[PDB]
RNA sequence: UUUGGCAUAGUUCC
């Protein structure tokens, strides 16, 4: 159930929609402009 | 002396002038009841206020 | 018949 090397995150999980909701006028939460920032440095 | 029944209370009572107050805190601002109204979105649980 | 949030201040009751 917990193998040591997978606690090096490699892949990273993205929540869906439902934990980061829009806002209504569209506003974005503090998890998904984490979530871009991460994402650009990535590809980056 | 009594109201209702016109007879005299048996204890002398203390009445006199005294300078009341009404306070800003009224009944028709306090009082709030819910039965299945609006919903939060982020837990899906009733709305706070 | 449709739903904003974060912060700060004041007040009520133990």
């Known amino acids: 159930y917990a193998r040591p090397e997978w606690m090096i995150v490699t892949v990273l999980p993205v929540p869906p ?3 980061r909701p ?3 006028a569209r506003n974005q939460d503090d998890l998904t402009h984490k979530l871009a920032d991460i994402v650009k440095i990535n590809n980056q | 002396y009594n109201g209702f029944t016109g007879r005299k209370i ?7 002038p005294t300078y009341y107050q009404r306070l800003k805190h009224m009944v028709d601002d306090k009082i709030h009841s819910r039965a ?3 919903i939060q979105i982020l837990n899906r649980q009733p709305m706070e206020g």
């Open chain 2, 10 to 16: 048996t204890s002398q009572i203390f009445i006199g």
């Open chain 1, 17 to 19: 929609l439902s934990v």
């Open chain 2, 36 to 38: 299945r109204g609006p």
């Open chain 1, 22 to 24: 829009a806002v209504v």
